[PDB]
């Protein structure tokens, strides 16, 4: 009331937690991007890749929040923890951290989906599938591809490999 | 036969009942629209809003019927009950009636979805989600927004509020 | 080294703190925007106003971070505190909170400027002036104008006033 | 007289010295560019990079000279010392020399700025900031980025690294 229908308090809470996770991921990507722009790191294509991901994660959080309002739920925001590292190592280190991060979001989506199914909320299930689950699978595949490529490159002409990957994959 | 597959008689019947509900809702909106065009009511933006909804509900019924034929089911039509009122009061009265009506359609969709799930008809589930459930949530949110706005306006310069809402929200 | 010149550790730290403040302000505006989109609040022009400000504050933080890298400093991120409220009251309440927030950013800029001057960092001084100080003054004037208008409107036909301001100022 | 106002003889002299430094830097870049075009060096992208910088430094000197005339001061030219080397080594050697050179110009700008501040010449301060200090910071960041990239590349497939950097960064 006035609009809320078939929308459990459990799903509402889980949506707010998922928003926090997406915003945390956005923040992590922000840090990753600026790290690669340091004068002693200087890989612009890596910066650009992570900046784009920062945007995508913020967009995901905003989509969740709009959905929360559309269903008559109430957005509740919590502190956003700072990212897990201050310095992110080399390109393969960063790509590995990103995959870990996306898999964690993907698992949260799956957990929310199960909740929605358990709550007989078929509409949430359809909202998650068409707007989040498919994007995560595609993203994780791209990241895995990138990691395989960078790993193949840095074994074992590491500096050269890192430069070529940035120039010929990421700057493309 | 020749085409019907995984399509229960229970789902077929429920689809025919849902068509009747959508057509009844279309009829209700038709009445709502013409009521607002009465010379002693005269709120054209309210008429236009309800006319559009009459169209949307008829389109929903037609989509259901096409789906029924696509699955090899058989459309069966019943009497369409006249709308619940002959006169619809003020704008907030009408908006309230519309929300009640849409929530009832939404609940029928959810009930059909449960049936489809219980009948292991995963394709129906996907047809309902992508084409009906999402539209209902969006519509009900817009209606709730409209009701909040009109309520804020008519407490307590009612005539003035009703005119402004029609001019600046509905005629937009 | 390799590039850092005339860039004190004090200024570097103050820049990182200012980034945190800008990102916190962005988060606050995010919350403000979604609050106004609640079905029981429903003022889209107010949502849009705060969404734009969320974007502007994130852009400010990003400009500071790029500057930090350009000077050879190192970005360090901290936890982002959640916004001061979960519910933001009426339009004038929200506008008041926004002015308080911007004045706080403005004062942080002035404090950083003083630091830069004290550190004989004339280039920072010029970066802050041309890219942050002028924007804050303009923004605060717009906010003050909005607050004066909304205050004039809600004394004392509050609901009506709030609607008109959203329609005729914010939706413009 | 007829126009000179708030323009000290100390600032006038310092401006003439800064012109000499900018023109010397232009000359150094001229030499750097032609060195990379030697048939036994043959890195056209490196030549082009330094040619552009030669142009930028001459433009800076000309801007200073126009400013000197605008303020009613008198341009005085001195001998331009030849560049510090006749042969410039490899790409990282040259990039290092360029950074040393730009940092020296940057420090001269900062020294002139301090003078201007000490002379209560707020207009000079604004001329230097908006037209010279910002450009130097941006330039030095680009140079530092280039040096980090080339260093990463030439450790330790030096010839290969030098070619790739010229083709994929400088020729871009
Ligand atoms: Pd509600
Ligand atoms: Pd960057
Ligand atoms: Pd970048
Ligand atoms: Pd970037
Ligand atoms: Pd939804
Ligand atoms: Pd499901
Ligand atoms: Pd699902
Ligand atoms: Pd490119
Ligand atoms: Pd058949
Ligand atoms: Pd009509
Ligand atoms: Pd009409
Ligand atoms: Pd009409
Ligand atoms: Pd179908
Ligand atoms: Pd299903
Ligand atoms: Pd379904
Ligand atoms: Pd009109
Ligand atoms: Pd450095
Ligand atoms: Pd919104
Ligand atoms: Pd909105
Ligand atoms: Pd909005
Ligand atoms: Pd700067
Ligand atoms: Pd200053
Ligand atoms: Pd300043
Ligand atoms: Pd408009
Ligand atoms: Pd003169
Ligand atoms: Pd050349
Ligand atoms: Pd050349
Ligand atoms: Pd050239
Ligand atoms: Pd001047
Ligand atoms: Pd000054
Ligand atoms: Pd200055
Ligand atoms: Pd080319």
Curated annotation (Swiss-Prot), chains A, B, C, D:
Biological processes annotated in GO: intracellular iron ion homeostasis; iron ion transport
Binding sites annotated in the UniProt record for Fe cation: 52, 55-56, 59, 62
UniProt domain Ferritin-like diiron: residue ranges: 5-154
GO terms for MF: ferric iron binding; ferrous iron binding; iron ion binding
One of the Pfam families matching this protein, by short name: Ferritin
Annotated InterPro entries: Ferritin, Ferritin-like, Ferritin-like_diiron, Ferritin-like_SF, Ferritin_CS, Ferritin_DPS_dom
Keywords: Acetylation, Cytoplasm, Cytoplasmic vesicle, Iron, Iron storage, Lysosome, Metal-binding
Region described as Catalytic site for iron oxidation: 52-59
Gene3D superfamilies xref list: 1.20.1260.10
Subcellular localization: Cytoplasmic vesicle, Autophagosome; Cytoplasm; Autolysosome
Main location: cytoplasm
CDD domains: Ferritin
GO cellular component, one term: autophagosome
Described purpose of this protein according to its UniProt entry: Stores iron in a soluble, non-toxic, readily available form. Important for iron homeostasis. Iron is taken up in the ferrous form and deposited as ferric hydroxides after oxidation. Also plays a role in delivery of iron to cells. Mediates iron uptake in capsule cells of the developing kidney. Delivery to lysosomes by the cargo receptor NCOA4 for autophagic degradation and release or iron.
Similarity-based family: Belongs to the ferritin family.
Extra remark: In horse spleen the light chain is the major chain.
Subunit description: Oligomer of 24 subunits. There are two types of subunits: L (light) chain and H (heavy) chain. The major chain can be light or heavy, depending on the species and tissue type. The functional molecule forms a roughly spherical shell with a diameter of 12 nm and contains a central cavity into which the insoluble mineral iron core is deposited. Interacts with NCOA4.
PANTHER family: FERRITIN (PTHR11431), FERRITIN LIGHT CHAIN (PTHR11431:SF47)
Protein name: Ferritin light chain
Gene source species: Equus caballus
Species classification: Eukaryota, Metazoa, Chordata, Craniata, Vertebrata
Designated gene of the protein: FTL
